[PDB]
Design a protein around this ligand. Structure first.
Ligand SMILES: CCCCCC/C=C/CCCCCCCC(=O)O[C@H](COC(=O)CCCCCCCCCCC/C=C/CCCCCCCC)COP(=O)(O)OCC[N+](C)(C)C
Ligand SMILES: CCCCCC/C=C/CCCCCCCC(=O)O[C@H](COC(=O)CCCCCCCCCCC/C=C/CCCCCCCC)COP(=O)(O)OCC[N+](C)(C)C
Ligand SMILES: CCCCCC/C=C/CCCCCCCC(=O)O[C@H](COC(=O)CCCCCCCCCCC/C=C\CCCCCCCC)COP(=O)(O)OCC[N+](C)(C)C
Ligand SMILES: CCCCCC/C=C\CCCCCCCC(=O)O[C@H](COC(=O)CCCCCCCCCCC/C=C/CCCCCCCC)COP(=O)(O)OCC[N+](C)(C)C
Ligand SMILES: CCCCCC/C=C\CCCCCCCC(=O)O[C@H](COC(=O)CCCCCCCCCCC/C=C/CCCCCCCC)COP(=O)(O)OCC[N+](C)(C)C
Ligand SMILES: CCCCCC/C=C\CCCCCCCC(=O)O[C@H](COC(=O)CCCCCCCCCCC/C=C\CCCCCCCC)COP(=O)(O)OCC[N+](C)(C)C
Ligand SMILES: CCCCCC/C=C\CCCCCCCC(=O)O[C@H](COC(=O)CCCCCCCCCCC/C=C\CCCCCCCC)COP(=O)(O)OCC[N+](C)(C)C
Ligand SMILES: CCCCCC/C=C\CCCCCCCC(=O)O[C@H](COC(=O)CCCCCCCCCCC/C=C\CCCCCCCC)COP(=O)(O)OCC[N+](C)(C)C
Ligand SMILES: CCCCCC/C=C\CCCCCCCC(=O)O[C@H](COC(=O)CCCCCCCCCCC/C=C\CCCCCCCC)COP(=O)(O)OCC[N+](C)(C)C
Ligand SMILES: CCCCCC/C=C\CCCCCCCC(=O)O[C@H](COC(=O)CCCCCCCCCCC/C=C\CCCCCCCC)COP(=O)(O)OCC[N+](C)(C)C
Ligand SMILES: CCCCCC/C=C\CCCCCCCC(=O)O[C@H](COC(=O)CCCCCCCCCCC/C=C\CCCCCCCC)COP(=O)(O)OCC[N+](C)(C)C
Ligand code: NA
Ligand code: NA
Ligand code: NA
Lengths: 189, 398, 177
């Protein structure tokens, strides 16, 4: 794969916390690799781009998602692995390809709020994955027409859309065409 | 074998978690990533290629027919048969069909070129008649085959109530009848007797009507063939009972009104020695909408005669045969779902009849599922359990 | 018709019957006629092919079985007593007319075994007319009951597709008008 200590800590996380990570990160700056340490392309053809932040969020681990970004890691890594493709490419879970697009598509409002109005770095709600698809494009990709799915899709769809009006009081994020044109409404249709 | 879903369902999807008693689980939790959850069922008993007894053989063959469709519609069992259908089940079935359709072309061409003059029409000595000779021999090979395979099933899978099941119980007989009925014709074509032909003709019509067995490889045609036989039982016999009962009633009543040929040697005016029999055909054609009244009129009482035939039309055509359409509509509406469920038993029985017909090493080559170390066991020895992955999604239980 | 060949006609005749049967496309401007035309094609798929599969399968079965019981013209040059070189083919039409309720038995009777012959045709009527073709009515009733609503919904897709095929066929300034 290309896995290092820090993923293995987070994958085998238990009970919501694990105190190895602040020490391995404390050891990271001593080696001077924090930039390179919370950053890694698993070069597996099933995991081409997954980082510790992609892991931090899908585990519903708020405490470290606040951590990993604080040491200035990334919030834009394209998780382009075949696992991380739509189910018709021969994959399992498309969410976009980004940590912000994940936190939305994985029903985590708290992360999504934080990742935007966090101090150190912040993922803009405009960023396009390797298909053009922003976060709203990606919520249309994961919404099945069930009660529970359509519920938390519409909430966050609004949330980000109303939120991105506050910031960047310009072109609506719902107008951002992807790399075949189709806006989130056209993409749902 | 006893048809108990509540316990049967419980045992298969048994996921115990505590470290000691995890070898007792049969539904594992291989991997998860957000709202997609893999899972891994144990096929230790379910799928055993030859060298053990298996649940799936028991259900599909030896069980309670009343709920066998609910048994084959649980966690791996549906996707485990579909997987066999992909690998070998579909293919080998569609070799069986064309092998059979061809064998009935041969049994057809040998009948359209069977001679018709002289006690046994042997005199071959010709490229055509030697080509016909290939035909009868290939035929008799099928007859002796279907005879032994059914009597092999006598010392093997036969003796449930196999007379009216819609789950191949019907066709086991008719292939046996086909098998006997080719043997007898082969016996009489060699014993001089010239009724090799009449006995063959039944075998031929019976044989193409056995190609409905091969509608089991499609829900489309197989559900249809099931409704044919139910309607033949639940709807058509009760119709012929009454219909016959009327027919002897009126026919006898109508023969009585014709003057003998002890009078002038006519049928269409007089009656003698075949007048009953033909009326049964005319009064059959008449209700079918296929014959015309064409009043005989050569009767002591002509007007009573016409009043009766009209009551025969009204009762038998206008009322019984159009009620028969109505009853079918009630049948097909009732037995549609029930015919979907039978077909699933048909289809599964088809797969395992193929599988059982293979040697064991070939069944292990087509072994369905993947070997997995699900966990650790005695003195750290792993669990090498064949299992069957079933990916799943719920956007609810985070 | 320009290359000399005289089968311009036969090829035309198919085109003509095919063409009027394309006027059912224009039943899309009414739910009344358009839902109807949808049920025609479903029944043609879900109900009629499975019927011809079996029906054919019986027919070669009995027909071959019944041709076998007629004496050749290697005997006297008759069809209604003898059999030669077209006797299969016409039976397929007679046994077709017969199940349709459109032809008469009219027993041939010039056979080595006449009574086996009649026993078979009666089993052909019972199975093919009394049982298969009247079951076919029954199945349609299950079809039209199932696909009525589904045919209302298709028509709405038909109708909408009709509107936009017209609209797209206009210039832009007319579409803006
Ligand atoms: C539930 C109801 C059941 C009803 C059953 C049918 C009943 C009929 C009762 C009446 C009996 C009639 C007896 C006739 C006797 C007979 O035949 O006499 C003859 C000649 O004829 C006559 O003299 C009668 C002339 C009148 C004709 C009009 C009839 C009008 C009838 C109207 C009602 C029709 C019902 C129709 C069916 C409706 C059914 C619907 C429910 C469904 C369930 C069935 C014998 O000639 P002869 O001199 O011996 O020799 C021949 C010499 N020659 C005469 C030809 C020169
Ligand atoms: C699921 C059941 C399937 C049943 C299939 C039909 C089966 C029949 C079995 C019996 C075979 C009969 C063999 C006849 C052989 C034959 O043809 O012999 C002949 C002559 O005739 C006889 O000698 C027989 C005389 C008796 C007549 C009354 C029959 C009564 C039959 C009653 C049952 C009717 C069933 C009706 C249909 C009901 C179907 C309902 C479900 C729907 C699904 C199908 C050959 O003459 P030959 O001397 O060689 O040369 C000619 C010289 N000559 C004789 C004309 C002077
Ligand atoms: C997602 C997967 C997609 C794949 C799709 C394509 C698959 C194609 C598979 C086609 C092969 C299966 C059909 C063969 C014909 C057949 O089996 O015909 C059967 C019976 O045949 C026999 O008795 C002949 C015995 C020899 C057969 C094998 C020869 C071919 C071997 C090649 C297999 C290929 C794989 C491995 C190599 C083999 C070497 C060892 C492994 C090495 C490691 C790979 C017909 O049924 P019948 O008994 O008539 O029905 C029931 C009859 N009754 C009991 C009711 C009277
Ligand atoms: C468990 C099944 C076993 C069957 C038992 C029967 C076996 C054998 C009996 C055959 C021998 C009898 C005659 C011997 C004497 C003879 O040869 O007599 C002949 C005529 O005799 C016949 O024609 C006998 C009728 C044959 C048919 C029987 C029924 C066959 C089976 C019926 C079932 C199949 C149907 C299915 C219907 C389809 C619908 C279902 C849908 C169901 C859907 C679910 C005399 O004429 P001649 O010209 O003189 O012959 C030459 C003689 N000479 C001059 C050379 C000496
Ligand atoms: C993708 C489609 C494309 C079609 C491909 C076919 C095209 C071309 C083939 C035509 C040429 C073949 C004959 C050439 C030789 C010739 O000319 O031969 C002739 C006779 O030949 C024929 O009769 C050929 C049969 C024509 C019909 C074919 C099928 C047509 C299409 C079938 C589909 C349409 C139906 C629909 C059914 C409606 C129900 C649906 C409901 C569905 C509801 C959903 C010989 O006679 P002679 O007098 O000697 O001729 C004069 C010669 N001389 C003496 C002047 C030299
Ligand atoms: C004596 C020499 C004979 C040489 C061989 C001749 C025949 C070869 C058989 C070719 C097909 C076998 C491979 C199929 C693999 C496969 O994909 O099978 C199935 C799909 O296909 C079929 O069910 C067969 C489709 C219909 C066949 C027409 C009749 C062909 C014979 C006349 C995979 O399961 P599923 O999609 O879940 O099945 C559901 C079925 N549904 C909905 C897709 C139709
Ligand atoms: C990927 C493809 C690979 C192809 C490999 C081909 C390999 C071998 C070829 C030969 C296969 C023979 C297999 C027989 C298996 C068998 O036992 O068959 C039986 C069927 O009765 C027979 O066979 C009769 C025996 C006489 C031989 C056949 C006729 C003569 C030879 C014909 C062979 C050549 C064909 C056709 C040539 C033209 C093909 C046009 C393609 C076109 C494709 C669209 C299966 O009935 P059963 O299941 O047991 O059901 C019984 C009913 N009960 C008891 C279960 C209710
Ligand atoms: C008797 C032995 C056993 C036979 C079994 C196989 C029989 C037939 C093969 C058919 C396979 C394809 C059908 C799959 C349908 C299907 O899968 O789904 C059907 C949908 O059907 C259709 O849309 C239309 C169906 C009719 C198509 C016609 C073309 C195929 C036949 C080939 C052309 C024949 C002509 C001419 C030949 C050339 C002559 C030249 C020489 C001339 C002489 C010289 C229902 O779907 P649904 O409503 O979802 O129901 C659930 C069913 N589901 C999906 C779970 C299975
Ligand atoms: C349970 C009781 C069963 C008892 C059955 C008794 C069987 C037979 C008794 C008759 C013996 C005599 C027959 C000899 C055969 C023969 O050859 O007779 C011919 C006669 O001519 C024919 O055309 C044959 C007509 C046959 C009459 C059938 C009557 C009705 C029978 C009814 C049986 C069915 C029961 C019930 C159906 C139930 C339906 C609902 C379900 C309930 C389930 C439980 C002799 O000709 P000949 O005198 O030489 O010349 C002609 C006359 N001429 C010219 C001299 C005046
Ligand atoms: C094939 C190409 C496409 C054709 C499409 C158009 C076809 C036909 C035009 C019919 C339009 C009117 C029908 C509207 C019905 C309707 O809207 O609703 C129908 C109600 O129907 C009726 O009450 C009766 C209908 C029949 C009326 C007959 C008079 C019209 C035809 C003209 C006269 C023809 C004679 C003779 C001609 C003179 C000859 C002289 C030369 C002679 C030779 C010299 C159902 O309502 P509902 O139950 O609510 O279902 C929902 C449907 N809903 C409302 C949403 C659309
Ligand atoms: C998959 C296997 C397909 C194999 C097809 C093989 C095709 C043909 C083989 C026959 C070759 C010879 C034909 C030459 C043409 C010709 O001209 O023949 C004539 C013969 O006379 C005719 O009238 C033609 C009769 C045709 C017989 C058809 C039999 C049955 C065929 C069945 C095919 C359908 C299969 C299955 C249906 C499925 C239904 C369910 C869906 C399942 C979907 C998978 C030659 O006359 P001649 O000898 O000169 O004079 C007459 C004889 N006389 C006077 C000398 C005694
Ligand atoms: Na009629
Ligand atoms: Na008529
Ligand atoms: Na007529």
């Amino acid at each position: 794969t290309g896995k290092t200590c820090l993923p293995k800590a987070l994958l085998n996380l238990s009970n919501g916390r694990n105190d190895t990570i602040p020490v391995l990160l404390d050891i990271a700056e001593r080696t001077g690799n924090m930039r390179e340490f919370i950053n890694s392309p698993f070069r597996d053809i099933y995991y081409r781009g997954q980082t510790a932040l992609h892991i931090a969020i899908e585990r519903r681990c708020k405490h470290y998602v606040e951590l990993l970004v604080a040491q200035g890691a990334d919030v834009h890594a394209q998780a382009r692995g075949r696992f991380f493709q739509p189910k018709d490419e021969g994959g399992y879970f498309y969410f976009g390809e980004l940590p912000l697009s994940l936190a939305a598509c994985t029903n985590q409002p708290h992360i999504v709020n934080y990742l935007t109005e966090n101090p150190h770095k912040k993922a803009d709600m405009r960023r396009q994955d390797s298909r053009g698809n922003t976060v709203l494009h990606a919520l249309v990709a994961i919404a099945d027409n069930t009660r529970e799915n359509t519920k938390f899709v519409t909430k966050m769809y609004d949330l980000l859309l109303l939120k991105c009006a506050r910031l960047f009081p310009d072109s609506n994020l719902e107008a951002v065409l992807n790399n075949d044109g189709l806006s989130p409404l056209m993409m749902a249709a | 074998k006893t048809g108990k879903i509540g316990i049967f369902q419980h045992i298969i999807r048994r996921e115990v978690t505590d470290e000691d008693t995890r070898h007792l689980s049969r539904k594992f939790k291989d991997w998860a990533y957000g709202p997609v959850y893999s899972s891994l069922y144990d096929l230790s008993s379910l799928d055993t290629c030859g060298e053990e007894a298996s649940v799936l053989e028991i259900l599909v063959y030896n069980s309670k027919i009343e709920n066998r469709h609910e048994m084959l519609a649980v966690e791996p069992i549906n996707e485990l048969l579909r997987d066999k259908w992909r690998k070998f089940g579909a293919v080998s079935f569609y070799i069986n069909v064309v092998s059979y359709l061809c064998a009935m072309v041969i049994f057809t061409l040998t009948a359209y070129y069977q001679p018709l003059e002289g006690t046994p029409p042997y005199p071959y000595r010709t490229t055509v008649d030697y080509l016909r000779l290939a035909g009868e021999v290939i035929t008799l090979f099928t007859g002796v085959l279907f005879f032994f395979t059914n009597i092999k099933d006598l010392f093997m899978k036969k003796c449930p109530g196999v007379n009216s099941l819609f789950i191949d119980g019907s066709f086991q007989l008719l292939y046996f009848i086909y098998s006997v009925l080719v043997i007898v014709s082969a016996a009489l074509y060699l014993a001089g007797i010239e009724a090799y032909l009449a006995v063959m003709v039944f075998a031929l019509v019976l044989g193409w009507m056995n190609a409905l067995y091969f509608t089991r490889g499609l829900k489309l045609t197989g559900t249809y063939s099931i409704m044919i036989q139910k309607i033949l039982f639940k709807d058509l016999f009760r119709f012929l009972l009454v219909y016959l009962l009327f027919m002897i009633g009126y026919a006898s009543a109508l023969v009585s009104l014709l003057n003998p040929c002890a009078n002038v040697p006519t049928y269409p005016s007089c009656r003698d020695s075949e007048t009953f029999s033909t009326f049964l055909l005319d009064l059959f054609k008449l209700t079918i909408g296929m014959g015309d009244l064409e009043m005989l009129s050569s009767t002591k009482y002509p007007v009573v005669f016409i009043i009766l035939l009209v009551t025969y039309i009204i009762l038998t055509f206008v009322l019984l045969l159009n009620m028969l359409i109505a009853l079918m509509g009630e049948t097909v509406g009732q037995v549609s779902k029930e015919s979907k469920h039978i077909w699933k038993l048909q289809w599964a029985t088809t797969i395992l009849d193929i599988e059982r017909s293979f040697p064991v090493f070939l069944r292990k080559a087509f072994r369905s599922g993947e070997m997995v170390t699900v966990g650790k066991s005695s003195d750290g020895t792993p669990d090498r359990r064949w299992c069957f992955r079933v990916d799943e999604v719920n956007w609810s239980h985070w």
